[PDB]
Amino acid sequence: MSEKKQPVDEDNWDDDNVEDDFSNQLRAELEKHGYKMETS
Amino acid sequence: GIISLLDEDEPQLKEFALHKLNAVVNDFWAEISESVDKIEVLYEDEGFRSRQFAALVASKVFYHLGAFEESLNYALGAGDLFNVNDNSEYVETIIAKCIDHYTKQCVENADLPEGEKKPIDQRLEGIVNKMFQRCLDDHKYKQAIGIALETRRLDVFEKTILESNDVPGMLAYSLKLCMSLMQNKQFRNKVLRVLVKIYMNLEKPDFINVCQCLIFLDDPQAVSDILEKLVKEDNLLMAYQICFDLYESASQQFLSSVIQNLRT
Amino acid sequence: GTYTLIIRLRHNVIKTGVRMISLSYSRISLADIAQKLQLDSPEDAEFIV
Amino acid sequence: MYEQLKGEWNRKSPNLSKCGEELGRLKLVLLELNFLPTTGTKLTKQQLILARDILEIGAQWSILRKDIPSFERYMAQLKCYYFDYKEQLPESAYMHQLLGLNLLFLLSQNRVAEFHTELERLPAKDIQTNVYIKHPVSLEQYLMEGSYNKVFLAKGNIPAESYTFFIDILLDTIRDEIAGCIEKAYEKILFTEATRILFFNTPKKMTDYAKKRGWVLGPNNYYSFASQQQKPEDTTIPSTELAKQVIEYARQLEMIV
Amino acid sequence: DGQATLLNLLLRNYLHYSLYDQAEKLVSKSVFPEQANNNEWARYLYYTGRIKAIQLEYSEARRTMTNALRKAPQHTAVGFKQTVHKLLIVVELLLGE
Numbered sequence A: 001m002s003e004k005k006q007p008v009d010e011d012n013w014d015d016d017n018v019e020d021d022f023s024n025q026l027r028a029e030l031e032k033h034g035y036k037m038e039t040s
Numbered sequence B: 001g002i003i004s005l006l007d008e009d010e011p012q013l014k015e016f017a018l019h020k021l022n023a024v025v026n027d028f029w030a031e032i033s034e035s036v037d038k039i040e041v042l043y044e045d046e047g048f049r050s051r052q053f054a055a056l057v058a059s060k061v062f063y064h065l066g067a068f069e070e071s072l073n074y075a076l077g078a079g080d081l082f083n084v085n086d087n088s089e090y091v092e093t094i095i096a097k098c099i100d101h102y103t104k105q106c107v108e109n110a111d112l113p114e115g116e117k118k119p120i121d122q123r124l125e126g127i128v129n130k131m132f133q134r135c136l137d138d139h140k141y142k143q144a145i146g147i148a149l150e151t152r153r154l155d156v157f158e159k160t161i162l163e164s165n166d167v168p169g170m171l172a173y174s175l176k177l178c179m180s181l182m183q184n185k186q187f188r189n190k191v192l193r194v195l196v197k198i199y200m201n202l203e204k205p206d207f208i209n210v211c212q213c214l215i216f217l218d219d220p221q222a223v224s225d226i227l228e229k230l231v232k233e234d235n236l237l238m239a240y241q242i243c244f245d246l247y248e249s250a251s252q253q254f255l256s257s258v259i260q261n262l263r264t
Numbered sequence C: 001g002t003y004t005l006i007i008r009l010r011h012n013v014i015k016t017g018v019r020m021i022s023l024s025y026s027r028i029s030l031a032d033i034a035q036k037l038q039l040d041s042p043e044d045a046e047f048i049v
Numbered sequence D: 001m002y003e004q005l006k007g008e009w010n011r012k013s014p015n016l017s018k019c020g021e022e023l024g025r026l027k028l029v030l031l032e033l034n035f036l037p038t039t040g041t042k043l044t045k046q047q048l049i050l051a052r053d054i055l056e057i058g059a060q061w062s063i064l065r066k067d068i069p070s071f072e073r074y075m076a077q078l079k080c081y082y083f084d085y086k087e088q089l090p091e092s093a094y095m096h097q098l099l100g101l102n103l104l105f106l107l108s109q110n111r112v113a114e115f116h117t118e119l120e121r122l123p124a125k126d127i128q129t130n131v132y133i134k135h136p137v138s139l140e141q142y143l144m145e146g147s148y149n150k151v152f153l154a155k156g157n158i159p160a161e162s163y164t165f166f167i168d169i170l171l172d173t174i175r176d177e178i179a180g181c182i183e184k185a186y187e188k189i190l191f192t193e194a195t196r197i198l199f200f201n202t203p204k205k206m207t208d209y210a211k212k213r214g215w216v217l218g219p220n221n222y223y224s225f226a227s228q229q230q231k232p233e234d235t236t237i238p239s240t241e242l243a244k245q246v247i248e249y250a251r252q253l254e255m256i257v
Numbered sequence E: 001d002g003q004a005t006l007l008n009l010l011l012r013n014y015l016h017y018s019l020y021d022q023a024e025k026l027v028s029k030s031v032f033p034e035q036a037n038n039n040e041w042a043r044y045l046y047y048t049g050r051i052k053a054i055q056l057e058y059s060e061a062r063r064t065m066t067n068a069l070r071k072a073p074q075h076t077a078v079g080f081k082q083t084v085h086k087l088l089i090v091v092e093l094l095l096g097e
Helices: A014-021 A032-039 B013-019 B039-044 B054-064 B068-076 B091-111 B126-137 B154-159 B174-180 B186-198 B208-215 B222-233 B244-249 B252-263 C010-024 C030-036 D019-032 D049-064 D068-082 D096-108 D112-116 D131-144 D149-154 D164-172 D205-210 D236-251 E005-014 E040-047 E049-054 E062-070 E081-093
Strands: none
Touching: B013 B054, B013 D019, B039 B054, B054 B068, B054 B091, B068 B091, B091 B126, B154 B186, B174 B186, B186 B208, B208 B222, B208 B244, B222 B252, B244 B252, C010 C030, D019 D049, D049 D068, D049 D096, D068 D096, D096 D112, D096 D131, D096 D164, D131 D149, E005 E040, E040 E049, E040 E062, E049 E062, E049 E081, E062 E081
């Protein structure tokens, strides 16, 4: 059993959805708001 | 690719198209399998010389795709080019439907032969007795005893009592076989009444089968006829097992119906 | 060897965008959506819309 | 070498009395040898490259005379000759400009499943090279989305050849499409905007469309009959179909299957 | 057992090719090999899934990709389960979901 011919060769998931939405967005807010204080 | 020139309207390129329909009928057999079926166009066309082979290759391709009787009509109408080869894994495909519709029609021809019978396409019965002679000549008489029943035809089975296999007890024990597997009375009595007359026209006419068939067959005069042959021969030693099998097996109505034929 | 199926996704990207914006904003100029979708042409952003 | 066509092939003899001797000449090819891919005798190619070049120019003047059904006969034979794994020319100055020409007419055939079943035949020749075949696939790819103007820019921006009979089928199949998108939920359009959305200044082609469909010719006006009112509020069709489906529920519910 | 293996084993280079035999696989009778042992049967639905991938998924075969996935065993993903795990959604990226 399991011969399986080879043509080629929590802890994770809540972290994966917040990885999905929380992906590539500024990463380092301590200064973004403190620089929008005077510019905005 | 050769399918593209099926609109030439020159009756030589249809011929050249069917030049490439038998050797290369395994790769773009997949191609022209469902798209183009213009066999019946040139086949029904007045353009001859190229329709004969056309129904062969349609009988090839429509066979494998379930269009069986489609391959069977083209199988009949394909002609001399079609039946010329029995050296393949393809004659097995076409006689499987030909002898099919033959004998399943011949059940209805055992029902009503007289009127609305078969318009045979002259090979639908031709390969029947053709390959049946192949049964008669390829030494197989356990099947030549059988396809002569498969045709449901009395006189070809009556013909095969005289074949390249002799009659020691062959075609005599066969009624012991077929009396068991005997379907109805309607097929039984017809073959039964004709085999037991050639049993009387045999060299040594058997007596227990012709008494047994006649109590199976209800002929209360013919056993008085051959009983008159046994009075005429005048040996009650051989006029014996024709008689106590008749009393032992037969009924009071039957023996009371044959007694007039005996006393007269 | 999926790349021929990969190449056709710009349609679903831009339908994703137009369902996104058309769901998001309500009375939005077409002279904003070409710039926000970096389409570089509003004149056919009448036509994608 | 049994040529009988080495004189009037390159010069324009436009539907003159060459094509009969040309076709019967190709019939004379058949008497010498079948157009079977000639599995043996790879060295003999006069049945292959010398016949096939005649067959592809025979594909070529078919579109100039607008020979559509026999055109694809030649082109189908060409594809079934480039099916040959026998070592030939890998291409010519014609294989892009004929195979993708089949792709461009087949684009104009409105058959897209056959437009994309081709694409195994040239994987690297799509984006990374072969711009002349990158042009029709990006063209039809622009026919996917709302790219109109860009498609009408590619109409005229051909680098490969004429492509004219294909961009005229393409000049129409978008004519009825813009004639489709007069019929969308619009305001009054004057006789300038939708007048210039195709390619016209002011002919009676806008009378052909404005009398073909609605948005009727008026005082600088395109009339909106945006009704879409009749079809809703139907209980009886769910009362037929749903009452079918409830008995369908009851079938595999108590009675055994 | 001849209706089963002779069709993925027919499919495996025709997919790699661009031969017509996808529509022949449409008109084929042997599309069902009748309980093909959950290995050829399992992958078979994938092998017909990429058919309508190259012939334009209209959300028809994402259920036969999903079905090919759920009939696949516990061995390793690197065999083909990568490529159904990729291609299974590749066709739903085509839808938008």
